[model samples]
Target: MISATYRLQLNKNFNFGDVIDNLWYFKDLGVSHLYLSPVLMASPGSNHGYDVIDHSRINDELGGEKEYRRLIETAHTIGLGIIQDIVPNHMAVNSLNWRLMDVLKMGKKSKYYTYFDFFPEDDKIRLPILGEDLDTVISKGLLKIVKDGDEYFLEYFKWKLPLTEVGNDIYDTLQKQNYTLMSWKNPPSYRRFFDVNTLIGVNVEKDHVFQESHSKILDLDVDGYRIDHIDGLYDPEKYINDLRSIIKNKIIIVEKILGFQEELKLNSDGTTGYDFLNYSNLLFNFNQEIMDSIYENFTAEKISISESIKKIKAQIIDELFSYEVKRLASQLGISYDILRDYLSCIDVYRTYANQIVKECDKTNEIEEATKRNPEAYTKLQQYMPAVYAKAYEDTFLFRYNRLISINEVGSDLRYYKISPDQFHVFNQKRRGKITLNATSTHDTKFSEDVRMKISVLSEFPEEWKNKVEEWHSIINPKVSRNDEYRYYQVLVGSFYEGFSNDFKERIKQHMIKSVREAKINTSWRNQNKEYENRVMELVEETFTNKDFIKSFMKFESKIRRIGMIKSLSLVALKIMSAGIPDFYQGTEIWRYLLTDPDNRVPVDFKKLHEILEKSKKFEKNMLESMDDGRIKMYLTYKLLSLRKQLAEDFLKGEYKGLDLEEGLCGFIRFNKILVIIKTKGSVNYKLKLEEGAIYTDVLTGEEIKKEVQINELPRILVRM
Candidate 1:
């Protein structure tokens, strides 16, 4: 099926009500289903909607239940379906949830205490939220008791706490409750979703919790669900299997990273497609800059790979995952170092909780952990994948800033290397119906076009290094190695996003989130405003200077011409490749964005309508010339319209590889439709076809003569 999700991120600016008029536009664009971002009640003013506060009701801030139903009704009226993104792993750890509020007020006797994954040795649930000690906050009246209807509540800065009593005994009264106020840096005795303490993990293993959380999805009777953070669940296999029993014959895809067959063997349609992107990147040899960066950074430490990872994990623990390490240590009554060593050796995103690690008596971390206790090693290994993700993908990937392409969310390598044959092998074994074939999403480090620009470094490495050196001379940041490396990575990614005063604020917002997520010089929990100022100073130093702006634009224009071709070729592969393809909101045009809020920027559908209307009169290949982004919109319309008409052929067709020489990748579907893509080198390869088979070019409406030449073209999709 042809599907694309419109990610609605704002509270009041855009909501489900905004989708009413756009239903016809989507139907015309050949989109069978409108995939939605989270519609459940999240925290107040939450932009991206992953931090859900309540699951029982729709988000009232986003036009509530009535407006949501109206949109669904309107979509079906125009021959469109819906797929809702769901978050079952965790909920907002704030007073917005009555269940969590009750647990905080009454402690163990709250009746709802078992719903969360807290492992406290005492009745107190440590809230790592205080700016100072309890004594200081009490004296300043920063923490006080107030009365609302039928309830006594404690009001701190932005947090509202329910209380059993009030008055001059406020200090004594708070001490008697089920929770404690502590500094933000302190660790807690429970697992969180990655390193986010505020997003407290839920015990979804409980039947009541699953029923209460996911009931809205069924009640809504939406077409399907996209499960966010599948790896974060305590027991994903059982939970997914149970979910399938009730929600029959509907699509269910998980937000899984680097999903191999072992991971996909569980019950689900398939995973969101990072593996496809990683494989395709290799077919084009898009890893030179990233490879060099990793070789230098990893070799600089002067230790073995195993030993170096241990050191990296130590830094990760000190800065990010101290709570996780401390929790596992307390469970087994073991030293912190033992658990830390075990966590350092994990090589993937996650292992199922039921899987065990066995050793052949080799000299390594796995051997040592299994020697201690196989069960303990297995349990702790579950946490390492999450731990390794924060350290390597979040922190170190940015530090190795030679290329931002490998800095992607789920890439599992110090470098990337694969072949066309390898990609075909991987796809044939695991491809399924409704499997999402995607190039961009809300969670990406950069937009697809921005990445296309950055990917050119793989083909032109010397020029890339030369540019970085020349730019750093004028736009130097006065910071340490950790901060400097990350600054350069953000610099390159921001450049393709733009290079003028108009884009300065957008880049600043992107850089702020980038630095905080990297967790190097500063972090979200720890405010380093003075240190963060140095980063902003570089932006002011560069983007504001007239001469620097002129020099940057000239360089960007040179790359933009070539990068546009790469972007078109990449888009073609995404549409024609295996699995069901889905586009992020406005990516059908140019994706000039960086990360979340930037990616979530609203789309101007009126402008899109104007472009599509104008391009309809021209040949599909006419899209390759226009620079104002009408080209991409045209390509999207043509390809998606054809795909919807040929859905069954795409799903059940067998793949036949067409042999080609260097610089060309080609394949045939249904023994009828043929796709040819050109990569980095000069396009001079020739396609080998059967002796008597005739083919017609689908897009250009041309007859293909025997021995078809494939030089000087980036793409060709034909029907046999």
Candidate 2:
């Protein structure tokens, strides 16, 4: 149950009235507690509010603390709990640190000092910027600079002005400069956050720092917290103890990253599920033969995940990892060019993993790699590299570092947003919150629905093999919005996993050019580009024929929506299976989204509202059917509601995997109740059941057993 006026208008414009009104939307969605993104003032145009500017007051854009109180009071009227997102790990360096710099520019005339993260007065300090730059760049000091807004009146964290901005003069004797850096107030030693300048890690492992930073929220009586970046904070024991003293019956969730499935638990709840780093098996539904060959045959030198990352990044000046390394080097006290060279030599034998592979096939280099390796031509060989890139990227970067730091570790382990013990220790007493989980986010590589469209192509490889390759020939030559916005992610995902750079790049150029012409052979490539020209010719031979576009969309989501709809129902069953079910902003209907800005497009409110209403109808029917007992919906909604209503009990229940068929996963939360689910097929898959089995599905009115076990239920994901 999170309340906020964000995503109302592309992650901003959270008017107080909007927040107040929207608060009940979630409340009505069967949530007991509410969590919010940061409600503090932030840098302009912030999408997710991590880049904060002020600390003392609430965001007036939504409302000040007074209005916040009203929101709480009103929420309590509905018996809803509240959770505030806390960032004790880092502050808005723009305002707070900037003010400290200004004070030093004043020669100790300011009121605020020792309140920021910086170097001392005598030492030179510089802002830490993390991106590309022309000319030589030097980061003198990692100052947590503060930026203030006339309306917002809060500073932010920046290395230096990205472009250029005026700096305060220390020697101006006549008057202390306005908007000056408090040069005298820098910290002598490294603060934390892996010694980074901007993300200054706090000593929260220490008691005093805990009190000073978090006391405000804890004392404010918010029921829980979404602790940010627990990985940066040291000493979990101390942080938990400090928490125990300040609050009672509160929920805490740490944002810990996970690669393996090792259960994580402590004095807190579980994590935000950010663990792709330890995923033992390949994800994203790739071709098995290609994946095996690529992983086994690449000699660890040519196709290792880390090495692939370096080689791919080396060719491109502005790859994400390359840039991040340069940024990290500045904090580590090194030069970008120096880091770049060392990085070039360093053999990182891996690339992006998981979902990344699915979306990277259109690139030409991958296609080239496949040609070079005959094994690639044999099966789905060309796509293996891209598949690896996708999977590894998701695991290493998003899941391992950024996501684990900002999301999983922060929300699950460190804080009691949910009880870590319940998640791994037991089943019933799980501290599950109402969630909106999805593979793709606003910051993700693609949209959920769009990926679903591509999933149709990749998942049914055996059935649509010839059609897809033919369609790829047509679509590659005529790469349209539908291709990039729809199928490209999957194409690239498949191509990169098994191929190399040259092939991947050529494919990309060919596809991009063809998409523009919308016709085959008007012909971008000439004799000089011999192979590219040949590929174009081959595409012309196949794609130029009729039934082309129809064939593509027919098998994809456009005509295959019913299949998608049916599949989504199964996904919904899994979402509601025993634990909390989370939905992304616009996914209530069909989320055919693809990659960043495309995925981030505004929600079609009318359609979304309609679908939500439809879901509610299903939920209502499920609630009425508990006595019938066998419906998948019945068990999911009823058991989930039991937890939503008596969350503590649900969180405290024991978790057990039920003996069910494959695709049918079953678990018991507490001993009294067991949740059985069918991940694939129907809730009412062909299975034997005992006569008069009193165990009811609790959701829809489908009986399970001799009284005519009524289950038009989904997969056997039952909560016992």
Candidate 3:
């Protein structure tokens, strides 16, 4: 059984060698297993390994099989286990994917023809790589035939596509190939992962495809596997059962986003816990009036969360997924508008048709769609998850910047706060399940500490509202009102003592991705360079402006004080909660980073190791000097160490919510361990205990009698 897991993002910059170097660091930190990202071969120079190209071989860029086995051997020697992330949903559409490349060259006669999901009637596979029309590209003499060793390839600027034969005329050869070069504007006929055309979906439901994709991973000696995008598969339940038949004893966790009311119906042990991530963060968000005030000040128009999401979903269906909608409609013999409406009405990512229809049906729209066409709806259900995710999670989240902290991967903007009673019910429901109690992941919009800092704004609504108005007065009017409001939140969330070149660049990149994803003034498909340049210039000018910085820091300092306290509280709650605590890489201390590639930046493990060595004892001085982040690091180390000693109590113990005063949230595990933390305001309350029972404070080593004094910092007491 896994007690706690630490997630690490492996790339060319950091690989199996890095893990070997830090095995002792992870061991000392007391994580039972090191949960790694995808280890298979991905596209060339790919940083994050989710874009896997080959499943049978280990990525040579990460030192391949030699280093992988070495790390596995070393980890077990130190009483550490490993959990690997597997990508069975899709593969990169590039020449490196031998299966895809072979199918491209041989057409339907290829041995791997059934490996991918594509329409059988389509004669030519559409490769949307042309910069302009085919004639224009050919007229510019950009297309040519290149021979390497004995094989010939059709070479574009950087893309080298395979050819069946080398003919005298390059144009004649291109006309007779198995693939057609199409303009980038036209979407591919094949199924894709969301709107990403570069990654084509695989037919993993087939037995052969399943065996071929997971053969290498199945042979590895890892303790568990984290299935990526299980909902993307055609039959997720069958896939889980098949995977379990092979790896029966190993833990199986899926990457799924459950709606607020939906339940996990998969046959796996549990999900990756986006539900927990959103629920845990909401516990910290207390004030609704401030949230409403911030919304009114920032937003130009009035709209409810449901209406805003509905509008965005309809727009995305027309803009990005029009081709997919038409194709599905044609397959089902339904009108395009009817299919589009049904898809937009879906609230969750997907619904399983094979299971009890009531469990999968999240909304009335789904129930109606099912009644209209049961067989057609099963096929339509597969496309709904990705389409809805692209619209809501990817698109609308960037557009709706009201309390950007709540606009996270697993968050719901409908509710700002979760009462303690609701939170307790959530925990008690997952009593025996081994779900991850995650605060941050690679997919999170902001780091846990950064969100906590921004969450502090809710407690000080008047001050925040005034600061926003004052900051707006200082900036130039080139930036839009919505962008400016979000930028102010970004500044407060990512604020540090000093600004560096790297910090400015991170902020600029985040804003660029944000606006592009929002798709209002600019977008990924058609970037408005001039508009983007204006946004970046505004960012640069704001950083150089002394007046803005002074006023921002004056208000930010107070939030930072309370935010740091909340940060400690978050760490304690995650570890002591009902599930297995999972920590993202480099989050032990303060990680004030935005979305990836900012959050995915290389972690300085050397500095962390030094800090861990120095953070052996708890000290008040560390709290006073919290900028170094040793205070947060020390608290994590202590809690994880205690968790290891009481694994059974945490894993199987009953979760009972403690009755404490307002502004405080507390719980007890196994009736012998008590956990409490102040969520808001000053906490000068006393926690009553059993008479004549001696309890020891884990952080300060103080012995308490009948009552325990509660302060701002999180407290954990063990009966002796």
Model 1 CA deviation exceeding 4 Å by range: 1-11, 259-263, 286-310, 333-335, 359-382, 473-498, 512-534, 544-547, 619-625, 681-693, 707-714
Worst 10-residue stretch by lDDT in candidate 1? Answer: 354-363
- Estimate, for each residue in 1-720, the C-alpha lDDT of model 2 and write its tens digit: 332111222245554455577655655555565556677666666656665555555666666678778877887887777766677666544434454445435433444434443334334334343332211221432333334552112222333331123335312311222333333222222232422334543445555556655645665757766666554444454576678776855767655443332345346654443332111001112343542333233212222444544544453323323433443444444455643444343222112211112224334433344445533122221112222332233322321111111121112211212122223333332334322223334444443333333433333444454564555566554322233222333442223122345444444553434332222223321223544455455444433456664565444433244223233433443343334343445443444443344455555444434434444334554334322212222233343454465555443334564565443444554555544433322224556555545554544534455322213344322322
Backbone clashes for every candidate come to: 0, 201, 0
lDDT of the candidates, in the order given: 0.69, 0.41, 0.84
Displacement of the residue 484 alpha carbon in candidate 2, Å: 8.9
Looking at model 2, which ten-residue stretch has the lowest summed lDDT? 276-285
TM-score of 2: 0.60
Best by lDDT: 3
Give model 3's TM-score versus the native structure: 0.96
Q: How well does candidate 1 match the true structure in TM-score terms?
A: 0.90
Off by over 4 Å in 3: 166-168, 354-376, 681-690
